[PDB]
Design a binder for this molecule. Structure first.
Ligand code: L4Z
Ligand code: 47J
Ligand code: CA
Ligand code: CA
Ligand code: CA
Ligand code: CA
Ligand code: ZN
Length: 316
């Protein structure tokens, strides 16, 4: 809407206080005009109609329990925007400052979040498997990264190309979590998953097998569930990305780590310059090798480490 930019204050899903960019016109709206063509957060009101209504608040204070998922969806969308702009010189998900829209309170007891082709959508969880999923910065950045992928490589959401799609979202979700520097790790969704169980998460990038996901191409799932295992076989690529950044020896193959920043540069270049809608794992390896060569040189440690990491997970 048309109005003046304001700064509200509220509490997120985990009880932390943060400032949020709002817009005043009669009400205070979750509309951040400081980033691109805006970040807009909507109330789906426990229904499945999208986007719902632009979030309106009478006093610019967002401390009610019902407000918490909206605060975090709005704030973490901003952090993710900042990561892509400051780190990769990318202006929003389309590179042209497209408005970023999110809806919270989607459905009832909904244990998921997604990008629907046009916007981000967050369930509240059932209180047992999940609390409201926008409480996870890695979750928010994972979802917005799907938008980046759709506008760049366009990886089809099935089989190997879909597992790469998923891994790209886990990689950049994790790099955004490190960028914000609040309890960062290489696991996915730990801040909103199973409030009754400490130390778990949906997936691990450093040890995908911790939660049953493959860490080597020979262990890949080839059935039809989960669009051909997109959230399962992502573990193979997530492990390679972890090894590239942090190093390690995996199935007897040693990888010299090169750090998170170079991981991000290599995979961002691969995603935006070399990957295609039907890229498979072998083609991802080639794209990462070429990207590392462009950035650091053919004889660089960075190129050597990309090759070792894909060797370690059985991807040639
Ligand atoms: C309805 C729905 C939920 C999810 C998981 N979200 C994700 O992987 O970002 N998907 C792909 N589709
Ligand atoms: C990873 C994967 C899954 C399938 C079949 N659904 N293929 C051929 N590859
Ligand atoms: Ca209020
Ligand atoms: Ca964390
Ligand atoms: Ca995490
Ligand atoms: Ca938990
Ligand atoms: Zn995803």
């Amino acid at each position: 809407i048309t109005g003046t930019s304001t700064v509200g204050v509220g509490r997120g899903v985990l009880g932390d206080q943060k400032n949020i960019n709002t817009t005043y016109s009669t009400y205070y709206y979750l509309q951040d005009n400081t980033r691109g063509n805006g970040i807009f957060t909507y109330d789906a009101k426990y229904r499945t109609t999208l986007p719902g209504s632009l979030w309106a608040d009478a006093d610019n204070q967002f401390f009610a329990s019902y407000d918490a998922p909206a605060v975090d969806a709005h704030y973490y969308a901003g952090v993710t925007y900042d990561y892509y702009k400051n780190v990769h010189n990318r202006l929003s998900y389309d590179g042209n400052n497209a408005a970023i829209r999110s809806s919270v309170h989607y459905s009832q007891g909904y244990n998921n979040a997604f990008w629907n082709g046009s916007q981000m959508v967050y369930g509240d969880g059932d209180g047992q498997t999940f609390i409201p999923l926008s409480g996870g910065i890695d979750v928010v950045a994972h979802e917005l990264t799907h938008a980046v992928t759709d506008y760049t490589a366009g990886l089809i959401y099935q089989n190997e190309s879909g597992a790469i799609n998923e891994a790209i979202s886990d990689i950049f979700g994790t790099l955004v979590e490190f960028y914000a520097n609040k309890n960062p790790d290489w696991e996915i969704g730990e801040d909103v998953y199973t409030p009754g169980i400490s130390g778990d998460s949906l997936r691990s990038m450093s040890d995908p097998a911790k939660y049953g996901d493959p860490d080597h191409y020979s262990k890949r799932y080839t059935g039809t569930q989960d669009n051909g295992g997109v959230h399962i076989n992502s573990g193979i690529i997530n492990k390679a990305a972890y090894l590239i950044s942090q190093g390690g020896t995996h199935y007897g193959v040693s990888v010299v780590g090169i750090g998170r920043d170079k991981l991000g540069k290599i995979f961002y270049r691969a995603l935006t310059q070399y990957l295609t809608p039907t890229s498979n794992f072998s083609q991802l390896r080639a794209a990462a090798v070429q990207s590392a060569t462009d950035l650091y040189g053919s004889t660089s440690q960075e190129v050597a480490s990309v090759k070792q990491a894909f060797d370690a997970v059985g991807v040639k």
